[PDB]
């Protein structure tokens, strides 16, 4: 063949197989992340797996804060994830400097995604093998959830997942939105945790998951403590 | 300080210039030639700040001859005038303005004789007769007095001699000898130097 092995060249069917391989690179990590939106809150959950006891559990995280009121969860290569996180923080601060107001979540996602496009069009560099999911509150639009992928697609979502169990998780979430009644903050967090736990079969403990939330009442992105996570987990088991 | 004069006619253009190149007060050269033949039927007369004159004249000459070699036909006098004007005008804004005052004289088979005038600021003007230098102030009135659009070439050399002997009578600097040449359909023709002993 040879139509793979370079991002620039098109297949005879015009598919650009290299970026599709970058999509597989996300699943190679073996972790899953889920994001679900609510009427007044947006949450991100992801597996936290510590391979060795010696590792400091505090340092390992896939949840990062792009700015005070935006948070992200990265899935894929850890290094590419950290690099994209840094680029996102730079883009947000530069937006604030130039335009005088906090970057919208959609525009941040668009900037990061079009950067991913310049990666998937120029020859020498490779697409970053990571996926981003951004959550924030916009005053006009309420909560928001968005996802960047290695291709440059940046579509917004009511709820999403990324990682190895993405298809199972989106099947689960699709059923839940179809039986739409609402999602308050507690139900939002419960839906996220139930989705992740059901698709993985994990039956989590508080250490195994890390959750981050935004709410219209408290717009700042915060990563909940193990105690708060256990509080939500116990509520799930009780009912 | 240097004198250029040009007289257009029905089928010719007459041009003359002083032959003095000078230091502060010493008149280093008595037989300096300020006329550069860009082509067979076009002359460029140049006066101005030293160095700039010869540099600009040579540059335009070599560009015109390159045009000749590349394309097989000579530039028109009007085209050469516009080209040298463009080169001078571009340099005016730049840090190396050529302080040069030029008179371009030519004959075109289609468009007949032409005399062109440009100053150091690179304005361009076609004219029936024109002059450059401090002597021009004295001698232009002679041309404006006795010039006719139908002047014959013998009458033209006579008129030029009147213009130059006025400089001899009144102009403070010493411009003892002048060079004269005519352009016509045949081409540039050297004429005997009008020399006032």
């Amino acid at each position: 063949a040879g139509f793979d092995r370079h991002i620039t060249i098109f297949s005879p069917e015009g598919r650009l197989y290299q970026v599709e391989y970058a999509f597989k690179a996300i699943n190679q990590g073996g972790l899953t992340s889920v994001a679900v939106r609510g009427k007044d809150c947006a949450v991100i959950v992801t597996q936290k797996k510590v391979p060795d006891k010696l590792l400091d559990s505090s340092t390992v995280t896939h949840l990062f804060k792009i700015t005070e009121n935006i948070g992200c969860v990265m899935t894929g290569m850890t290094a590419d994830s950290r690099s994209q996180v840094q680029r996102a923080r730079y883009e947000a601060a530069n937006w604030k400097y130039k335009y005088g107001y906090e970057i919208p979540v959609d525009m941040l996602c668009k900037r990061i995604a079009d950067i991913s496009q310049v990666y998937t069009q120029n020859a020498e560099m490779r697409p970053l093998g990571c996926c981003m999911i951004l959550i924030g509150i916009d005053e006009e639009q309420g909560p928001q959830v968005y996802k960047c992928d290695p291709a440059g697609y940046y579509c917004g979502f009511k709820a999403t997942a990324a990682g190895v169990k993405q298809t199972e998780s989106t099947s689960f979430l699709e059923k839940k939105v179809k039986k739409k009644f609402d999602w308050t903050f507690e139900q939002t967090v419960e839906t996220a945790i139930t989705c992740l736990s059901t698709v993985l079969s994990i039956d989590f403990k508080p250490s195994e998951i890390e959750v981050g939330v935004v709410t219209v009442e408290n717009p700042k992105f915060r990563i909940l403590t193990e105690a708060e996570i256990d509080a939500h987990l116990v509520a799930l088991a009780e009912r | 300080m240097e004198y250029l004069i040009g007289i257009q006619g029905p089928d010719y253009v007459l041009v003359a210039s002083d032959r003095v190149a000078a230091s502060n007060i010493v008149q280093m050269k008595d037989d300096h030639d300020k006329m550069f033949k860009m082509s067979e039927k076009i002359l460029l007369l140049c006066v101005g700040e030293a160095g700039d004159t010869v540099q600009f004249a040579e540059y335009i000459q070599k560009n015109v001859q390159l045009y000749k070699m590349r394309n097989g036909y000579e530039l028109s006098p009007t085209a050469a005038a516009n080209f040298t004007r463009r080169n001078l005008a571009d340099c005016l804004r730049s840090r190396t303005p050529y302080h040069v005052n030029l008179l371009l004289a030519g004959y075109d088979e289609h468009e007949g004789p032409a005399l062109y005038y440009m100053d150091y600021l690179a304005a361009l003007a076609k004219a029936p007769f024109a002059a450059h230098g401090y002597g021009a102030f004295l001698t232009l009135s002679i041309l404006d007095r006795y010039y006719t659009p139908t002047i014959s070439r013998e009458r033209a050399v006579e008129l030029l001699r009147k213009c130059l002997e006025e400089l001899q009578k009144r102009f403070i600097l010493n411009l003892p000898t002048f060079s004269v040449r005519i352009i016509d359909k045949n081409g540039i023709h050297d004429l005997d130097n009008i020399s006032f002993p």
Partner: protein, 229 residues
Amino acid sequence: RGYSFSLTTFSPSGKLVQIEYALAAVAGGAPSVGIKAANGVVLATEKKQKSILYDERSVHKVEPITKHIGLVYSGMGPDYRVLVHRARKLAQQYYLVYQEPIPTAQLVQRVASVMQEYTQSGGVRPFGVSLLICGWNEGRPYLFQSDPSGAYFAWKATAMGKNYVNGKTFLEKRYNEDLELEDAIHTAILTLKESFEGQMTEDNIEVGICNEAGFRRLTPTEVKDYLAA
């Protein structure tokens, strides 16, 4: 052979085959339809979503470059956005220079020049997207197509994407120059109705129109009203 991989290499028989492959990438893109009515021009495309989870309001396949110009695409989504930003920038540069809204023909020329600019260099790939650029200028409608090759053509009506040949045949059967846009939008949704393989709804399609007023994306309620027929 080697002609297949290189973009700056003419194949034997003189084909730049990577560009043909980019056109094949365009053909895989979703259906898009453009019909130039007498009083307007309609751009329509399917916005079929993988799941209910997708939020339709987040992204649009039909975008305005200017007040009086808008365009739609079939092909690669990221490439579409690169060139839509560049098109908006080119139009604003025209407005700064000439203080007049850019003509549609001029804009399609400029974006096609950009697309051609990309094909020449080996380090880059062609844009795997084609566009239908519609506009209303000088009290006249316009519709144009610009391909990955960097070439542009002027169509009374045309279709891109999946089943574009069959859609074009359906159009030339159904097309009348005297059509008003009220009818032309119906013809466009029918042209797409040929090729969905699904039950079209207000969400599953995105459609926009241009006229003396200018380009606009008619709302989900509007397209529901038109779909009711």
